[PDB]
What we know:
The structure is a homodimer. By secondary structure, chain A is of the alpha/beta class.
Amino acid sequence: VPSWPQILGRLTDNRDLARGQAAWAMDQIMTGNARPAQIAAFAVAMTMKAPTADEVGELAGVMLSHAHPLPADTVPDDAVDVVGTGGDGVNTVNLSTMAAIVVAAAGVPVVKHGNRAASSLSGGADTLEALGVRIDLGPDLVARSLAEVGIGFCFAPRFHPSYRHAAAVRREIGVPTVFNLLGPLTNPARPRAGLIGCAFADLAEVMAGVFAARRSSVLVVHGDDGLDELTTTTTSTIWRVAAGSVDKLTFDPAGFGFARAQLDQLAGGDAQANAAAVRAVLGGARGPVRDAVVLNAAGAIVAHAGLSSAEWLPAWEEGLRRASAAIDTGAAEQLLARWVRFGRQI
Amino acid sequence: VPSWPQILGRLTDNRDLARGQAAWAMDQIMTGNARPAQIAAFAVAMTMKAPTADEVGELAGVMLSHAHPLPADTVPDDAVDVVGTGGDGVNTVNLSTMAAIVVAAAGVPVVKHGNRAASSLSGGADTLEALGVRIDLGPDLVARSLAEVGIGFCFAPRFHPSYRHAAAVRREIGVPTVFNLLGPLTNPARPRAGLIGCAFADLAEVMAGVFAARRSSVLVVHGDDGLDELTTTTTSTIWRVAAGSVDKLTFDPAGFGFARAQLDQLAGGDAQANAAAVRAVLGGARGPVRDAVVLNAAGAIVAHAGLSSAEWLPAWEEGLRRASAAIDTGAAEQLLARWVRFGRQI
Lengths: 346, 346
Ligand SMILES: O=P(O)(O)OC[C@H]1O[C@H](OP(=O)(O)OP(=O)(O)O)[C@H](O)[C@@H]1O
Ligand SMILES: O=P(O)(O)OC[C@H]1O[C@H](OP(=O)(O)OP(=O)(O)O)[C@H](O)[C@@H]1O
Ligand SMILES: Cc1cccc(N)c1C(=O)O
Ligand SMILES: Cc1cccc(N)c1C(=O)O
Ligand SMILES: Cc1cccc(N)c1C(=O)O
Ligand SMILES: Cc1cccc(N)c1C(=O)O
Ligand SMILES: [Mg+2]
Ligand SMILES: [Mg+2]
Ligand SMILES: [Mg+2]
Ligand SMILES: [Mg+2]
C-alpha cells in the first residue's frame, strides 16, 4: 500500500525506494492526483537522497507511458537525438541544436526533443523558432518532417501534456531536481541513439544507467568545465552506453587536434543573437563555436554508429570528417533552408 | 538578494543557510506569499540538510512576530510550559497535559501551548475538551485563567492564524519536517522555563540551542524508547539548558526508586479514555501512569527552579516530592475542577 507519507518518509530517511514506489509517485503526478506540495516534496527529497538508475527509469518510463507517441513505423531504427539537461549556468550558444542540424545534413536521421530556455536566455526551441523552424508540430507532422527533411523536432509541452503539474512545480521552486533529468530521457519518438548532455556531474552516471536498460547506443557527456555538451575548453567525461552496459572514459579533443577554447568564446545571447550564431556557423565561419559544433556533431554520429557497430577511434575520425563536410559543402545550410521551407508549406 | 532558487539551491547542496535566509523564507510563508510547492520544498530541504539552532531560531522568531500576544503584564516572570513535538508514534496517555495540571497545582504558573492530535488518537487539547476545559480562548481569557486558576492554555490555531498555509502543507505531505519543531518554540505567552519533549533524537540538540539563545531554563528530553516525554520504561536523554549553555545527560529514573514500566502500561485511547486516565491519576491512583506523570511534573519543576538557581539531584528530589504532594493533598484534582469552573463562568 503506497502513500505520500510512506514514500517521502523513506526518502527523508535517506533510503532507496522499493521497486514500483517511484513509478506510483510519478503516476500520481502524471494523472493530476498529486498536490503541488506533494510534487515538490518528492522532487526535492529524491534529489537530496540521490536517485538511483532504477528509480529514474521508473519516473521516465511512467512519463513516456503518458506521452503522445509518433505514428507506427515513422521513426527509422537508427534515428539519433542530441539534447541535454540544460542548467549548466553558462549561457552558451545552442550547441546541441546546431550539432543536430549538422548531423541531419551528414545523412543521419535526427529526431530532436527540446524545450524553451529554463534559466538561459535562449533555449534550443527558442533559437529554432527565431530561425523560422516550426517547433509546434504534432506527431503526424513531425513524422513528415523526418521523412521529407531528415530532421524533426518534438516540442516537450506538445508531446507531454500530462507533465504540466510537474512543470509548474519545477518553475515555482526553481532549484534543479531529479525532474531536470527527465527531458533527455523522455523523447517521445524514442530514438535508439543519442548524444545526451548532463550538467550535473553526479547524475550523468544515473542517466547512463537508464539508457543501459533500453536498447540504446548513447554517449552521456559532461564537460569537465560543467557544460552539458562535449567541451572544447578542457576534457570531458563520457559514459558510453551500448548492449546494456556502460564504459566510462576521459575524452580529450586535443587528441584530434582541437585547440583549447575559453568559455567566453562560446557565450550566447538572446534568440535573435543565437539564431545569428547558427547562420554564421552554417555559412562556414571558422573559430571556437564551429569547433564545438563539429565536436558534438561527431559525438552524435559516433553514437549512431554504435547501433550497426566500427571501433571508437576510427568512428570519431569518420564522425569529425562527416560533420566538417556537412558544413563545408553547404549541406547543413541547405538542410536548414529546406526545414524552414517545409514548415512554411503547412 | 534572497529568493527560493538561491535558498533551496543552498540547502540541496547540503550547506547551512546564510544568516537571514531562513527568516526571509519564514516571512514569505507567514504572509501568504509562499506557494505550497515552495513551502514544501523548503520544509523538506531544511530537514534533509539538518537545521541549525540559528536557522530554527529565525523561523520561530518570525513566527512569534506574527502571533497574538497575551496582554502586557499578565504572564508571571516564572511561568513554565510542558509540551513536546509529538510524533513519537506510540499511543500514550496525555503525559504532558497531566504533568502540567500537577505542576500548576504545585504552585508553578503554567501556560500551556498545544494543539489537537496529529498522529495519535487523542492530543492534549482533545483530552482537555473531553474533561470539560474550554480550550479555544483568546489572549484576555488565557491571561485571566492564568491569574485565577494558575494555568492557561494557548490553542495554537487561535494564536497563530498566519501559520495556516504552512499547517496545510504539513498535513498534505505527512512526513515530519523541521516545522514539527516549531510548536514548542512558539508558545505565544513566551514562558521562560519548560520541560520540552522531542520525538526526534537528532533534533533535540537543535531545540536546546534555540532555548539557549533565549536564556531559557529548559530541559529538552527524549526517552531512549523514543517517547517525547521522560520515560519510565528506560533511560532518557536530557539536554539541560541553563545560563545560555546546553549540556547532554543520560537520566535514569531507577536512581529515584522508579521501577521499569512497559510501554503498553502507558497506552492511551480516544479522548474519553484519556480523560478517564487523567481523572484516575488526579484521584490518587497508583501505578505506571502516575509514576510517569510525577516524573515529568518533577522535570518541569526542576526547569522552573533553574530560573532562580541548585544541585541537580536534590532539585529532582524536591520536584518529585512536590509533584507527589500536589496529587496526594487533592490539590491537582482541585485545580482541574477550578479550571473547568473558570471556563463555565464565561
Ligand atoms: O535554459 P537551460 O535550463 O540552461 O536549457 C538550455 C537548453 O538546453 C536544453 O536543450 P538543448 O540541449 O536542446 O539546447 P542547446 O541547443 O542550447 O544545447 C534545454 O531544453 C534548453 O533548451
Ligand atoms: O498526535 P501527535 O503528533 O503524536 O502529538 C501528540 C500530542 O503531543 C503534543 O502535545 P502535548 O505534549 O502537549 O500533549 P500530551 O499531553 O498528549 O503529551 C501535540 O500537540 C499533541 O497534543
Ligand atoms: C515546460 C513543459 C515541459 C514538458 C512538458 C510540459 N507539459 C511542459 C509545460 O509547461 O506544460
Ligand atoms: C523538455 C526537455 C526535453 C529535453 C531536454 C530538456 N532539458 C527538457 C527540459 O528541461 O524542459
Ligand atoms: C495545526 C495548526 C497549528 C498552528 C497554527 C495553525 N493555524 C494550525 C492550523 O491547522 O491552521
Ligand atoms: C501548535 C503546537 C504547540 C506545541 C506543540 C506542538 N506539537 C504543536 C503542534 O505540532 O501543533
Ligand atoms: Mg544542449
Ligand atoms: Mg548546453
Ligand atoms: Mg507531550
Ligand atoms: Mg507524548
